[PDB]
Scaffold this active site. Structure first.
Site, short mmCIF file in Angstrom:
data_model
loop_
_atom_site.label_atom_id
_atom_site.label_comp_id
_atom_site.label_asym_id
_atom_site.label_seq_id
_atom_site.Cartn_x
_atom_site.Cartn_y
_atom_site.Cartn_z
N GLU A 81 4.15 2.52 -9.02
CA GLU A 81 4.73 2.85 -7.73
C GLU A 81 5.52 1.68 -7.16
O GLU A 81 4.94 0.64 -6.82
CB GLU A 81 3.63 3.27 -6.75
CG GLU A 81 4.14 3.56 -5.34
CD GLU A 81 3.02 4.02 -4.43
OE1 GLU A 81 1.84 3.79 -4.76
OE2 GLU A 81 3.33 4.62 -3.38
N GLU A 129 0.43 10.87 1.70
CA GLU A 129 -0.19 9.56 1.90
C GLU A 129 0.37 8.99 3.19
O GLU A 129 1.34 8.25 3.16
CB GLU A 129 0.08 8.61 0.73
CG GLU A 129 -0.78 7.35 0.83
CD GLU A 129 -0.20 6.11 0.17
OE1 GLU A 129 1.01 6.03 -0.10
OE2 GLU A 129 -0.99 5.17 -0.07
#
Ligand SMILES: O=C(CO)[C@@H](O)CO
Ligand SMILES: [Mn+2]
Length: 270
Positions: free
Chosen positions: A150, A244
């Site tokens: 990520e 998220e």
């Protein structure tokens, strides 16, 4: 064919085993009630959790765990896959192997975010070489685990800030067991053109994190999710879109509900 997942925050089970179990149950029940198809969790050290209890909960609620986050291994325990001290590098690899053991029980992705570490005054090139060595070690150590790298914004790390940074590393690792996790909050800072960045990721996009520009529930900032979901359709993305975000506005439940409504509308009109 995209699916919606919710990241649920959990207390550390070392600090409070009952709090972890309570947080997890509450979060999974919330996710199911709102309509999410899976949940995503984050754990610092998997060795202190009773995972068979977690699997029973997952089975009872018909709610898979789609991804496991690892960032607290760095933030709390200082473990990094690029640490200049090779002893800590080894301990980081050993920790992430434990995450893959849990992930295998659930068919979950293992997220490589902050656990990759920072440049710490070194060249990008050295940091990247150490990282690639560690990822190759992880692949040698695991038979089934799948990892996602990520990209994170500049304030969280100076190592892998863009999708292009990650694609370059994927070409060097050369394994289909490693892909990209793109996060809209981080992309809002670091990417020039987000639809173009996602087209460049293409088949390598394995997982997706959504939060608005202020990291509130999608719908509550000014991020252009419409263009993003148009692009996800165009590249044939059919895996998870995982919320998220901060518990804003109005707390964890309200944020999860707002996020779901925003995303569900985009997906269904797409
Ligand atoms: O995005 C992430 C983890 O996915 C980091 O910023 C830590 O929250
Ligand atoms: Mn993220």
């Amino acid at each position: 064919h995209m699916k919606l997942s919710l990241v649920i925050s959990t207390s550390d089970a070392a600090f409070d085993a009952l709090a972890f179990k309570g947080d997890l149950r509450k979060g999974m029940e919330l996710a199911k009630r709102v309509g999410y198809q899976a949940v995503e969790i984050a754990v610092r050290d998997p060795s202190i959790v009773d995972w068979n209890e977690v699997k029973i909960l997952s089975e009872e609620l018909n709610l898979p765990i789609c991804a496991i986050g690892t960032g607290q291994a760095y933030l709390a325990d200082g473990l990094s896959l690029t640490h200049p001290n090779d002893e800590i590098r080894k301990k980081a690899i050993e920790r992430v192997v434990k995450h893959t053991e849990v992930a295998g029980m659930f068919g979950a992705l293992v997220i490589i975010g902050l656990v990759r570490g920072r440049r710490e005054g070194r060249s990008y090139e050295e940091t990247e070489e150490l990282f690639i060595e560690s990822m190759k070690r992880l692949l040698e150590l695991t038979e089934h685990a799948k990892f996602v790298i990520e990209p994170l914004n500049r304030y969280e790390t100076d190592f892998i800030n863009t999708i292009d940074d990650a694609l370059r590393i994927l070409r060097k690792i050369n394994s289909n067991r490693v892909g990209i996790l793109a996060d809209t909050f981080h992309m809002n800072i670091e990417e020039v053109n987000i639809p173009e960045s996602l087209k460049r990721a293409g088949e390598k996009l394995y997982h997706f994190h959504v939060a608005d520009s202020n990291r509130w529930a999608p719908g509550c900032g000014h991020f252009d999710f419409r263009s993003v979901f148009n692009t996800l359709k165009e590249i044939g993305y059919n895996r998870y879109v995982s919320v998220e975000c901060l518990p804003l506005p109005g707390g964890m439940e309200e944020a999860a509900e707002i996020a779901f409504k925003t995303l569900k509308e985009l997906i269904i009109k797409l």
